[PDB]
Write a protein that binds this DNA or RNA. Structure first.
Ligand SMILES: [Mg+2]
Ligand SMILES: [Mg+2]
Ligand SMILES: [Mg+2]
Ligand SMILES: [Mg+2]
Ligand SMILES: [Mg+2]
Ligand SMILES: [Mg+2]
Ligand SMILES: [Mg+2]
Ligand SMILES: [Mg+2]
Lengths: 101, 63, 305, 132, 204, 94, 122
RNA sequence: CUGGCGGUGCUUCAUAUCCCUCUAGAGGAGCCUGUUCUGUAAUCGAUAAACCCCGAUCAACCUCACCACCUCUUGCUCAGCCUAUAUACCGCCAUCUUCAGCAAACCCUGAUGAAGGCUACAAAGUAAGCGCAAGUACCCACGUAAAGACGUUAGGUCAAGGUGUAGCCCAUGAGGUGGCAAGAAAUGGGCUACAUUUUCUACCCCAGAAACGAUAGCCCUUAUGAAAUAAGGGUCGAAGGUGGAUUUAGCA
């Protein structure tokens, strides 16, 4: 029930990236290492490469939440400032308002 | 306007105060005073000619 | 006019309720109790002196609508109703008659206060003419009763804060009282602890001023207090520093030393120093990178293209 | 010409309500805070979800009450709930009001597992504050 | 017309009973006509009948000072009195100087869990427990950022686990294992070095 | 989607464009064929729980659409305007 | 209104460090007054201070789409109100927290209490 | 008669402003950053104040809704619609705005014409309403913050949501690898340095000399990983030559 298809793209990417993380971290740690020759390093590289596409946090693009709008989006609030700015103007945000100084 | 219309600079003259005038002194007292600067320190070594020479020779604000 | 009485009755009922129901059982509770209640059980979360909950006498807050000057059958009671602002014209006529009589014999308030006292409009030229008439009556050589009645409006002028007093000198530890002051200059801080009489050296946490100010202008700035007081070497110090850099810290230390010295210096010298300005702070902070610009103050380059 | 929440004047005959008659910068001067949640702190989590829930419940209560709202809502938070202070406009009958309130409460409780009990304030005429 | 217990309420009534449960302002049941609103150049703050500024306020009408005092005097029970432990935390440190920190934040909304406020240390004095006196020449330097200059705050912090009860259990087990493996010294316990001495031990 | 939802007065103003409401959709009677003790039955005096067939609800919706069409037709009702001197003008009109 | 006092061992808080965060000053003052009243009714002292705010401003473009000339200033404030307590039984502390949370201001006036237990030794 | 316009006359103001004075930088070369677009299977919207260090707060793919190759009728949405419509809007923002007026309801005048209504030693003007004003925050009420009103620019946006007409109905849609991130041709801006306090060192302001710039490559692709743009580690430790009007803000 998302607006644009980029929303579903990013949702699937995030899901398939969060599916597996233990092996990813293990192989990332095994990579950068002076111990053990390059044999096991290349073996682990081929293993991590054998994984399917999509399943990867690299493809995750932190956009907004309305219709995927990566334009000054705040990851702390996820959703863009489309409605957040409206609230900050009205006053529906406990604190987040115009910097009165 | 970075300078506030309330605060105003002081008067560093003091050699003359060693002996109308009382009214001027009271007026000077009744004035929003400020602190003196470090670059243009109007002390004993504040020679106007040499002061201006150094100010002009100032590069990158290193008086 | 009926609305004024209705609101007065409503305010009286509200006062009676807030007195009886709440713990504050005395009906003579002042506005301090209402302010405390507003601060506690009405966290407005604001700071406006107007929008905040202000429930007091309606006459003190409402622009009272002048009641009907005449009842039935018309006939305005005042003999100067068709002149607009009967009170102002009546006062002007009274002043003119007083001036004529006194001739035959041979600070002011603000428009807002007058409008609050009465309920008649007022312009600028009318107030100017009124001030002119007042000055004429005051400087035209008159009796005493009229002059007093005219000056009655010239209420207090408010004249407070002028000279400086002695700072906390602290008469403890020993007979030689030692003061504790502080100085600030452009986000700087420095507390100086100048002792009383005692020729020796001006120390700074063990380091002398000679070992702390390699510059000559810094030496002159640090000496200015003693240079003016003429007491070169007679007080010890143990000033501290926290924050700043070079000139800012120097100015803070200078201010702290000047305050600690004025704490035990002749009143005349203290006043002369305060006039010199070495006892206050100059709020001059570095620039602020504007958000709608590029650099510190330089706006966008080709924004107009 | 920026025109956020401030309304542009046209003629002195605009029956605007109280909250609607306030600029969007008076949040710290005249205008208060409608909705509140720890998400807008420095710094606590739980912000995006709270804002989404608030924006959804606002439209939900405005739709369930078509035209029966004298002005915008004023959300709140006390426990595992979300109190909604509204100035209802006397339009339908009290029986219908009670029925709809109970239905919405039960539906929200069985949907979000959070009893969002609201509060009403029946007022016939809209609280006109200014004639912009 | 004539709402219930609003303006016709008997004057001088128990205010604590007027707002027993936390609820919004509800101007239809408040005998205090507060003048809330912003004044116009020739206007007056809107009446109390409908002021959204009163609802935007978090509202503290419930639990007034008198009501707060009554509720406190009532809830004085449902608790357990504490013995004359003497304030200032001096005797507490003289006896049991153990002090494990723990905090808890607050959140608004459906969720209540907040695992972020789980910071916990393992501050337990070694000399106070009195079970491995031989560790004086060991734990004085084996542990990290300790060996203070002036004061003395021995804390074998080991926040490698989140919980607190299991933290204390692990602390007890670690003290036992340290006793065991220290009463049978390793190697360089006494024969330290020639340029690093926290406590004098031959040679030199 | 839900993010594509907002008010209706704004959409109406946008569709109109003049620069440079739930009557047919009842609120009381459920839009789904159902009977309840509240309304549509004796106001609490046979208070029970029943359900209407989807065909009955479709017929009710068709009746509401017919009411909307009747209102629209009423909006098309003509009026009498006396012609002043010149046709379709305010000449000698009163 | 029953004591319900048992005979099991309880925990004793050693120096209960308390801190309340809040944006504006009116709500914070109301909260601190309520807390001080509750503490005085319980019988505990407190101590406050005058800390500054927390300027965590975050600026972004003014218009939602094109245009970047002028930005917007958005930031939140917070004033720390320390009201640390000292010596209080576990049940008393629990009841105090319950009474404080039964009416805590949502969003504004965020509490930051830091407990310090002891846990008896072996 | 109203307005526009005048190298249109007179009078008063501009206080970094319009000049009579002064500062660091563009008008000399390389990396990043955009645009119209020739490569192309590669959205490109504004393209003189109102558009480009705007998605850029970053073009290995994610950004990319473009085709080389496959997909479907229930189209995750009772779809996608980025397929035209923003010169059809709601909504959002920009200059004038370095401003002070803008108006409902009334009255008077012009033999009762479009229209005008100012002379305080006072000749017809009264003016609720909005704004300047006023009021409010951190460190005060100052300094920093919010507003800069009616309106020209049919100012820009289907590109955050729907949107006046048309249509793809077995896609004009999006989803699986690839790609556009070098300049046919024109060019602004951020950094490297254009030399004697540039580059090197000590006294934490006790002095001089040759008279200096990996700017990019290659692997580990950092930061991750199906697959690698300024790189943390092994090869550029040199080479450029303050430029003529004009230009940006700046009273401490
Ligand atoms: Mg600048
Ligand atoms: Mg005709
Ligand atoms: Mg499309
Ligand atoms: Mg457009
Ligand atoms: Mg402007
Ligand atoms: Mg502003
Ligand atoms: Mg404003
Ligand atoms: Mg356009």
């Amino acid at each position: 029930h998302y607006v644009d298809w980029r929303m579903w793209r990013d949702v699937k990417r995030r899901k398939m990236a969060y599916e597996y993380a233990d092996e990813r971290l293990r192989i990332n740690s095994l990579r950068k290492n002076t111990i053990l020759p390059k044999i096991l390093q290349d073996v682990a590289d081929e293993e991590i490469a054998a994984l399917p596409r999509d399943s990867c946090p690299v493809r995750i693009r932190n956009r907004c939440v309305m219709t995927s709008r990566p334009r000054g989006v705040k990851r702390r609030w996820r959703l863009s400032r489309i409605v957040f700015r409206h609230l900050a103007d009205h006053g529906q945000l406990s604190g987040i308002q115009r910097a009165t100084w | 306007s970075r300078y506030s219309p309330e605060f105003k600079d002081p008067l560093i003259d003091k050699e003359y105060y060693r002996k109308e005038e009382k009214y001027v002194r009271e007026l000077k007292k009744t004035q929003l005073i400020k602190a003196a600067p470090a670059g243009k320190t109007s002390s004993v070594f504040e020679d106007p000619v040499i002061s201006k020479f150094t100010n002009m020779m100032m590069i990158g604000g290193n008086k | 006019e009926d609305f004024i009485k209705k609101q007065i009755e409503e305010f009286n009922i509200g006062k009676r309720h807030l007195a009886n129901m709440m713990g504050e059982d005395p009906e003579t509770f002042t506005q301090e109790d209402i302010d405390r209640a507003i601060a506690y059980l009405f966290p407005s979360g604001l700071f406006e002196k107007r929008a905040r909950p202000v429930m007091k006498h309606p006459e003190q807050i409402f622009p009272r609508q002048r009641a009907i000057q005449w009842g039935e059958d018309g006939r305005p009671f005042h003999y100067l109703f068709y002149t607009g602002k009967q009170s102002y014209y009546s006062l002007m006529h009274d002043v003119y008659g007083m001036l004529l009589n006194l001739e035959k014999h041979q600070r002011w308030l603000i428009k807002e206060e007058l409008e609050e006292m009465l309920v008649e409009k007022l312009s600028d030229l009318d107030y100017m003419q009124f001030i002119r008439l007042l000055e004429k009556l005051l400087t035209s050589q008159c009796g005493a009763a009229e002059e007093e009645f005219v000056q009655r409006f010239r209420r207090s002028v408010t004249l407070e804060s002028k000279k400086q007093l002695i700072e906390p000198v602290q008469y403890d530890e020993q007979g030689m009282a030692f003061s504790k002051s502080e100085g600030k200059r452009k986000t700087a801080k420095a507390e100086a602890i100048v002792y009383k009489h005692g020729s020796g050296r001006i120390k700074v946490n063990g380091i002398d001023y000679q070992l702390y100010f390699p510059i000559t202008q810094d030496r002159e700035q640090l000496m200015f207090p003693f240079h003016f007081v003429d007491r070169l070497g007679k007080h010890d110090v143990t000033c501290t520093v926290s924050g700043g850099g070079r000139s800012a810290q120097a100015g803070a230390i200078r201010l702290a030393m000047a305050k600690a010295l004025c704490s035990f210096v002749t009143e005349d010298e203290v006043e002369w120093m305060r006039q010199a300005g070495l006892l206050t702070t100059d709020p001059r902070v570095r620039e602020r990178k504007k958000p709608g610009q590029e650099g510190a103050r330089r706006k966008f380059t080709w924004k107009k293209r | 010409k920026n025109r956020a929440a401030r309304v542009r004047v046209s003629k002195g005959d605009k029956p605007v309500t109280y909250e609607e008659a306030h600029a969007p910068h008076y949040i710290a001067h005249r205008k208060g805070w409608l909705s509140l949640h720890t998400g807008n702190l420095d710094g606590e989590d739980h912000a995006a979800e709270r804002t989404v829930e608030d924006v959804f419940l606002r439209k939900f209560m405005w739709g369930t009450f078509p035209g029966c709202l004298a002005d915008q809502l004023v959300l709140k938070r006390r426990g595992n709930q979300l109190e909604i202070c509204a100035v209802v406009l006397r339009q339908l009958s009290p029986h219908k009001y009670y029925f709809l309130v109970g239905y919405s409460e039960t539906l929200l409780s069985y949907f979000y597992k959070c009893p969002v009990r609201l509060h009403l304030q029946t007022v016939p005429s809209k609280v006109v504050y200014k004639y912009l | 017309a004539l709402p219930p217990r609003t303006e016709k309420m008997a004057v001088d009534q128990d205010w604590p009973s007027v707002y027993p449960v936390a609820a919004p302002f509800k101007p239809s049941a408040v005998p205090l006509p507060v003048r809330m609103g912003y004044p116009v150049k020739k206007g007056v703050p809107m009446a109390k009948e409908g002021n959204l500024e009163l609802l935007k306020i978090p509202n503290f009408l419930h639990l007034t000072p008198v009501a707060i005092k009554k509720h406190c005097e009532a809830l004085k029970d449902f608790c357990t009195e504490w013995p004359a432990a003497l304030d200032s935390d001096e005797k507490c440190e003289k006896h049991f100087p153990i002090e494990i920190d723990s905090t808890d934040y607050v959140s608004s909304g459906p969720s209540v869990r907040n695992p972020r406020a789980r910071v916990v240390v393992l501050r337990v004095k070694l000399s106070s427990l009195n079970l491995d006196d031989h560790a004086k020449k060991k734990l004085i330097k084996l542990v990290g950022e300790r060996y203070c200059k002036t004061t003395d705050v021995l804390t074998i912090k080991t926040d490698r686990c989140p919980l607190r009860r299991q933290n204390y259990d692990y602390a007890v087990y670690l003290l036992t294992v340290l006793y065991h493996e220290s009463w049978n010294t390793e190697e360089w316990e006494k024969s330290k070095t020639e340029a690093d001495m926290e406590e004098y031990i031959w040679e030199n | 989607s839900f993010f594509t939802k907002l008010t209706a007065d704004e959409l109406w103003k946008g569709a109109l464009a003049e620069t440079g409401l739930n009557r047919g959709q009842i609120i009381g009677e459920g839009r789904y064929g159902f009977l309840w003790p509240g309304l549509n039955v004796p106001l609490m005096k046979v208070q029970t729980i029943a359900q209407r067939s989807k065909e009955e609800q479709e017929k009710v919706e068709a009746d509401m659409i017919q009411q909307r069409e009747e209102w629209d037709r009423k909006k098309k009702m003509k009026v009498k305007r006396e012609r002043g001197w010149s046709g379709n003008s305010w000449g000698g009109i009163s | 209104p029953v004591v319900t006092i048992s005979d099991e061992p309880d925990i004793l808080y050693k120096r209960l460090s308390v801190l309340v965060k809040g944006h504006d000053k009116a709500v914070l003052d109301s909260y601190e007054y309520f807390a001080v009243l509750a503490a005085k009714e319980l019988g505990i002292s407190i101590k406050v201070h005058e800390p500054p705010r927390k300027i965590e401003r975050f600026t972004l473009l003014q218009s939602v789409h094109i245009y970047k000339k002028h930005r917007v200033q958005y930031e939140m404030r917070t004033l720390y109100r320390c009201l640390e307590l000292e010596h209080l039984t576990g049940s008393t502390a629990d009841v105090y927290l319950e009474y404080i949370q039964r009416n805590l201001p949502e969003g504004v006036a965020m509490e930051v209490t830091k407990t310090q237990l002891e846990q008896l030794p072996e």
